[PDB]
Write a protein that binds this ligand. Structure first.
Ligand SMILES: O=C(Cc1ccccc1)Nc1nnc(NC2CCN(c3nnc(NC(=O)Cc4ccccc4)s3)CC2)s1
Ligand SMILES: O=C(Cc1ccccc1)Nc1nnc(NC2CCN(c3nnc(NC(=O)Cc4ccccc4)s3)CC2)s1
Lengths: 404, 404, 404, 404
C-alpha cells in the first residue's frame, strides 16, 4: 500500500527526482489548471517549497507526497485518466478547429453595442478540465441565459408542485409565442418573458429587492465556482427604459391574478431587468453550465448547489424551449439543452459530460448568435453528444469519453 | 489463455461437473431466455450431448467447452455481469411491484371491444434481457404506435434531408392539435395523423401497396427479432369504415400538393390503415422498442436494422410529439421517448438501456392507457431513467446500471 | 273618374291620337322593357290591333284604353314617376360612366378559362326598371354567388330556428379563413364552403338529388322572373375532379356529426358541385338580386318567392360574410350586401332600391372581380346607397330616388 | 296664402278662440316637448301674451299668429303629421308595453353598486319627438358607450384615411376577443379597448389633457342638444385603479409604435378613463343616439355636429363591432347599430328614425344589460326597424312611419 508515491513514479520515469514544471505541464495537460479550488492545498504547498531554496526546485518522494497528500484522490484519477474525457489534449485541438472553421461565418448583426469580430469558446467538463480559445475573458451580460438559472433556484427553494401552480411546463408553439398565458391562465413555461417574470416573483417572497438580488448572486456565485459574475448598471438602465414589451406582460399578469398574493408587480420587473444585466465571461459561465451537467454539484468545488429535482426540470425545459423559435430545430439537430440570449450567449450543456458558453455578438434573424449556432452543429457533427446519439453504435463520430 | 475454461468453474463452484439445469438456471438468471437466437448454436449442441445420455446428467469442462464455444463472447459477458442491468433479478421485482400497483388503477374507458381487466408489461434490454409480468402474450394492434417505426424506415432509405422536405420536426401545441399543416405547408411532425399519412407516401415509391406492405412487415420483422408481428384483417376493415377524419386529412394534403409527384392519395390512406392494424404482443413490441434503444441494432439478433441517423431522429420526435396532448407533461414528469396507441399500448424506450411496451385497453380522456400511464410515472419515480436525470447524483432513485 | 283616359292625354300632345312607337319609347324611357311579364296582356292586345291596320298604327282614346286597362295601375306608376327611381334615363348614363372608367382597370388573372376583356353590368330596380351596358348576355356560372340563394331557400322552407341548429350566423375573422367549424361544432356562417355544404343538406332531406335540383331550379326560376338560368355540365365535372378542398370539408363535417341523419355526404357534395355550376347572365341574375332587394317578391312578376324572414337573414349574412377576406373592407367603404364569385360575378343588392350583377373574369389577390370591385366603390362613391348613409343629410352624393 | 292662419283653423274647431292649455296638449300629442329649443321663441312669445292677461285664456287668429310666426315651419310639420313617426301617441303605448314586459325578466347581476331594479328607456326621434317611461332621469356612466362617439369626433377632425393608418375596420372573431393587434400591427376596429385607446391618441394631438377633455365635452354637449352630459369623478378614481388590463394594452401599443409621433402613452390612458367616466341620463343620451340617426345633425337643435363621412363609419362599426361577443348575434336578430357598456346601457340608433338609450344595471354573462337586451328583441319583433327588414313588405310587424 502506497497511494501518493504511486503517482510519483508515474510522473518520475522510474527516476531520481522531477522538476516542478514537468509536474506542472503534466498537470496542465490533464485538463485541470493550477487554479482549481479542490487543488488549493497542494498548490499552496508548492508556493511554499519553491521558496525553500532558489534551486529547481526538484521533488523527493516525500517532499512530493507532502504537497499532493491533500488532494491525492482527484490527482490520481487525473493522471490515471479516470476523467470523463481521458484524452483532453487532442479534444481541444478540434475545439480549436471547430472554432476557426466557425471563425469565418461573417453574417449577422449585433443588437441596440460590442465589436462584431469577437468570438470565444470555453469548456468545463463535469470533472474540471478546462479549455478556451479566442476572446473568452471579455465580459457580457447573460440576458435571457439567466432564465434557466433563476428557474432552478425557484424550484430548488419551493419544489416542483408549488412552482407549477403559477407557471406551466410545455413549449408555446411557433406562432403561439405571441401569447402570454396558456389555457389555464398561467404562462407557458419559464423560458419565455411571460413565465420568467412569474418565476422572478416566487424567489424569496416577503423580502425586498436589494436583499433578493444578493440571494441570487450567492446562488450564482456557488454555481460558478466563485469565478467572475458581475453586473452592468449600464445595461440595467437601458433594459428598464426600453422594456415596454415587458411592462406589457407585467400588467396582463396582475389582472389575470397570476402572481402570488401581495406581489408588488412593478417591484418584480425591476428585479427581472437586474437579473438580465448580470455579467459573466465565457470561462465564468461554462462552470455554471457544468453545474447543471453535474446534478447540481459545482465541478471545480464539489459543493452541491441545486437539488436534483431542480436540475432535472431546468434541463428538460432548456431542451424544448431554449432557443426561442429555433429550439424545435435545435432540439432536433443538436439536441442538447441550451439557452441563448441576445448578447451572443449560448449556455450549452452536455449532460454528464461537460458544459460550455459561446460568444459571438453577431446574431441571426431569430436572436441566436451566428458563430454560436454554427459551432454546435459542427460539435455534434463530430462527437456523439446529441441527446439521442447511441453511446455504443454511433457510426463515423468520435466519442471523447473513450481512448485510442 | 482459456476463455471457455474461464466460465466452467465460475458456475461450477470448483466442482468437476455441472448439472445442465443448474447452468441454465444460472442462465435464466441472466435474463436471457434459452431461445435467444445468438444462443441457438449453443442450445442445439446442448440438446445433442444431452441425448448422448438420458440419465441426468452433467457436463465436464471438455464437453461444456464445445457447447458454449459457439457463442462464448456474449455468454461470457452474461456471466461476468457485463450486461447493462447486472442484477436483472431484483429489477424484475420492481417491475412486478409497479405492475401490481398499477393494477388497482380502476378508471378509464375502453375504446370503440376487449375486456377492461387486461394489463401486461414486458421488458427487453439493449443486451437482450427479458421480463414479462401479467397478460403479455395476448395480441393487439399497434395503432399510432406504428408512426415512429415507419418514420425511421423512411430515413434509413431516403435520408434525413429528403424526408424533411415533406414533414416538419417540431411539436404543434395543444392549440394546434387540430390544424394539419404548419406555416411552410408541411405537417408539423411525423407523429400526428397528418404527418403519418405523408411519411407513408415516401416509402418504396414506384411500387404497389402489396410489395410496400411486405417491405414494412419484413423490416418490422427484423426490428422485433422475428417475434410475433401479425396483422388483424378485422381492424383494417372498420378503421376504414370509421376513418372519416383521415379522409379529411388526406384530401387536404392532396389539395396543398403535400405529397411527392404522382401519389395515389386514396391508396396511401389504404396502406396507412393497413399499417395501423399490424398486430404485435407486449413481448414482440418490446424488442422493437429495444432495437431503437440500441443504435438500430436488434438486441436479440445482432443485425443492423436501422442507420443511426434514423434511430436518432425517431427518438427525438417521440420525446416531444409522442403522447398526443400529454406529450408536454410526459416529457416533464417521465422524460422518456414514448408513443401511445388507441388500444392500450405505450411503446416506451429507455435509450442505451432497454425497451418496453405496456398495455391495458382502458384509455383516459386524452387517449393513453390509464394503467399504462400510472406505471410510467412510477418507473421514473423509482429509477433514474428520466432523460435528464443525472448518472452520478440522482438523489434517492435506484440506478439499475449499478451493483452494490 | 276615368284613369285609363288620364294616361291617354298624358302621353299624347293633348292631341289627335298616340303613335305607338312613341308609346313604347315613352315606355322604354320609364325603365321597363316591352318584355315585362306584368305587361304581357297590354303587350298582347297591341300585338293584336297592329295586325289590323297596315300603316300606323295610332291608337284613339278607346283603342288605347282597352290595351292598358288590365295593367292600368302598373302603367300609371311608370308615367306618374311613382317608381323607386323616377329619372332612370339619367341614372343609367352615370352607370355607363362608372362602367367606362372601370373599363381600364388593368391587372388580374383569370382562374383555371375565358377572355380577359369581358365586362358588363346590369341593373334592375325593386319596380322592374332595367339597364345594361357591356357584355351582359354571355352566360357564366354563379359559383359562390349561389350560396345566399340556397340559404334563402332553406330558411324559407324550414325557418330561422331549425336551420340555425346546423349553421351559425356570425362571420369568422380574417385568421379563420382556414377553419371550418366555430366553437359549437357548427360551420361559422353559410357563405363559406363548410356552411354552404351544410345548407345544401337541409334543402328537402329525404328526396333524391335529381328531384332536389329541380326544386332549386324551380325556385331559381321564381327568383329570376323566368329569365335565363342555365347549367354547364362542363364546369360541373371539372369542379368535381378538382374539388379536393371540398371533399376535405365534406369528411370533416361527416365525422363531427354536422349533417341531419340520413345525409349521404358524398351525394350532398355532388348537389353542391351542381349548384355551383348553374349558369345565369348579368341580366338574369340582376333580377334575382332584386327579388331580395324586394322583400321576397320578384319585381317583374309580383309573386312572393321568399318569406321575409328568409330575405332578412340572407341580406344580414351577405353583408358581413360576403366577399371572402375582403368583406370587412367592403362592408365599410361600400356597405351593400354583396356576394362574389370566382367566375367574375358580384351579386349586389341595394335594399328597397335595386339589384345588380357585375361580371369581368379578371380577379384580384382575394378572388373578387377587378372591374367588379372598382365599380361598386365608384357607384357608392357617387350615390348614397351605403347601408348607413343618411337619406336626409348625405353631403355631396347623388340620390337617385329623387328628381331634379 | 295664409301660412300661420292654416294651423289656427286646424287646431281650433272652426271656432272663436282656442284655449291655450289645449293648444299645448295639441302639441304634447305630437310627442314634441314644450322645452324644444327650436320652439323657444314660440314658447317665450306665448309666455308674454298670457301675462298680458290673468284670464283663462285663449288666442285669436292674430294672437296665435305672432306667437308661432317664429317656428311655424316645424310647428306645421308637427301638426300636418309630417314627422318621422306620425302617430306618436299610439307608439308610446307599445314602448310602455314592451317596457313592463322587459321589467319582469329578473335575470342578471350588476357589476363592481346600483340597485338591480332600476329600468329606464328613453326615445328621441330624428324630428325631436320624445317619450320616456321608468327611471329615465337617473344618471349613470357611458363607459364603452363612449367609443362610437369618440371615434366620430376623431374622423370628423382628421378624416377616414388618416385615422385608419392607426386602426383597422373589421370585427375580431369570437375567438379573438383576446388579441390586441392584427396582421398589420394595428388594433382591430375602434370599438375594442385596443383601438379606442389608440383613437383617443389622435383627438387634438399636441394639446394637453385639460383642453382635450373640454374639447370632447363641448362636442358631446352639442350632440345632446345641451342636455345632461356630466362627469363622475368618483368612478374615474376607480376606473384608474382597476384598469390593469388597459395598462397592459397601452404598453404593448407603445412597443409596436402604433401611436403617432410623440404620444405620452400614460396621459393618453388617463384621458381614456376620463372619457369612460362621463355621465348621462337615459334622456340625455337618447339625443346623442338620435344625432347619429340624423346624418350628424342634432334633432332637437338643428346644428351640424358631424361630417357625414364621420357618422357613416361610426354606424358601420357599431353594427358589427357593437355588443362585444354578442355583436354578431345581435347584428343578426336585431341588426341595429348599437353600443353597450358596463353601466347597464345600450346606445341604440335606428338610422333615419330615432335614437334611444336603455338602462337596467344588471348585465348578463357577456357584459350587456339584461332588461335592455330583452327589450330590443321585443322591439324588432314588434316593428320593421331591423337593418334588412324591407320597408314595403314586412309581414305581420308594425311600421310607425306609415299612418293607420
Ligand atoms: O396580434 C398580433 C399579430 C398577429 C396576430 C395574428 C396572426 C398574425 C399576427 N400580435 C400580438 N401581440 N400581443 C398580442 N396579444 C397577446 C395575446 C392576448 N392576451 C393573451 N395571451 N394568452 C391568452 N390566452 C388565454 O387567455 C387562454 C386561452 C388560450 C388559447 C385558447 C383558449 C384559452 S390571451 C395577451 C396579449 S397579439
Ligand atoms: O377548430 C375547430 C373548432 C374550434 C375552434 C376554436 C376553438 C375551439 C374549437 N374546428 C376545426 N378543426 N380543424 C380545423 N382546420 C382544418 C384542418 C387544419 N386546417 C389547417 N392546416 N394548416 C393551416 N395552416 C396554414 O395553412 C399555414 C398558416 C398557419 C398559421 C397561420 C397562418 C397560416 S390550417 C385546414 C382546415 S378547424
Amino acid at each position: 500500500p502506497s497511494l501518493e508515491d504511486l503517482l510519483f513514479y508515474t510522473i518520475a520515469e522510474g527516476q531520481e527526482k522531477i522538476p516542478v514544471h514537468k509536474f506542472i505541464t503534466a498537470l496542465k495537460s490533464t485538463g485541470l489548471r493550477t487554479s482549481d479550488p479542490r487543488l488549493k492545498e497542494c498548490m499552496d504547498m508548492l508556493r511554499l517549497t519553491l521558496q525553500t531554496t532558489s534551486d529547481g526546485v526538484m521533488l523527493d518522494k516525500d517532499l512530493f507526497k507532502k504537497c499532493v497528500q491533500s488532494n491525492i484522490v482527484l490527482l490520481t484519477q487525473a493522471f490515471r485518466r479516470k476523467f470523463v474525457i481521458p484524452d483532453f489534449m487532442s479534444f481541444t485541438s478540434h475545439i480549436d478547429e471547430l472554432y476557426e472553421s466557425a471563425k469565418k461565418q461573417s453574417g449577422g448583426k449585433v443588437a441596440d453595442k460590442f465589436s462584431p469580430d469577437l468570438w470565444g469558446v470555453s469548456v468545463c467538463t463535469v470533472d474540471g478540465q478546462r479549455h478556451s480559445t479566442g476572446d473568452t475573458k471579455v465580459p457580457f451580460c447573460l440576458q435571457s441565459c439567466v432564465k434557466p438559472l433563476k428557474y432552478a433556484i425557484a424550484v430548488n427553494d419551493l419544489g416542483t408542485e408549488y412552482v407549477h401552480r403559477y407557471v406551466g411546463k410545455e413549449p408555446s408553439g411557433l406562432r403561439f409565442n405571441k401569447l402570454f398565458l396558456n389555457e389555464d391562465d398561467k404562462p407557458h413555461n419559464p423560458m419565455v418573458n411571460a413565465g420568467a417574470i412569474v418565476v422572478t416573483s416566487l424567489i424569496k417572497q416577503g423580502v425586498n429587492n436589494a436583499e433578493k438580488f444578493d440571494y441570487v448572486m450567492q446562488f450564482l456565485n456557488k454555481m460558478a465556482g466563485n469565478e467572475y459574475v458581475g453586473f452592468s448598471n449600464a445595461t440595467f438602465q437601458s433594459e428598464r427604459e426600453s422594456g415596454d414589451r415587458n411592462f406589457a406582460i407585467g400588467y396582463y399578469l396582475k389582472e389575470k391574478k397570476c402572481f402570488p398574493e401581495g406581489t408588488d408587480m412593478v417591484g418584480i420587473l425591476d428585479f427581472y431587468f437586474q437579473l438580465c444585466s448580470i455579467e459573466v465571461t465565457c470561462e465564468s459561465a461554462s462552470v455554471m453550465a457544468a453545474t447543471l451537467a453535474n446534478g447540481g454539484f459545482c465541478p471545480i468545488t464539489g459543493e452541491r448547489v441545486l437539488s436534483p429535482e431542480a436540475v432535472r426540470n431546468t434541463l428538460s425545459l432548456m431542451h424544448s424551449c431554449g432557443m426561442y423559435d429555433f429550439s424545435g430545430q435545435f432540439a432536433f439537430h443538436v439536441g442538447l439543452p441550451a439557452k441563448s440570449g441576445v448578447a451572443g450567449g449560448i449556455l450549452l450543456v452536455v449532460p454528464n459530460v461537460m458544459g460550455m458558453m459561446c460568444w459571438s455578438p453577431p446574431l441571426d434573424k431569430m436572436g441566436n448568435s451566428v458563430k454560436g449556432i454554427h459551432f454546435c452543429h459542427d460539435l455534434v457533427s463530430l462527437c456523439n453528444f446529441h441527446n439521442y446519439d447511441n453511446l455504443r453504435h454511433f457510426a463515423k463520430k468520435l466519442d471523447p469519453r473513450r481512448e485510442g
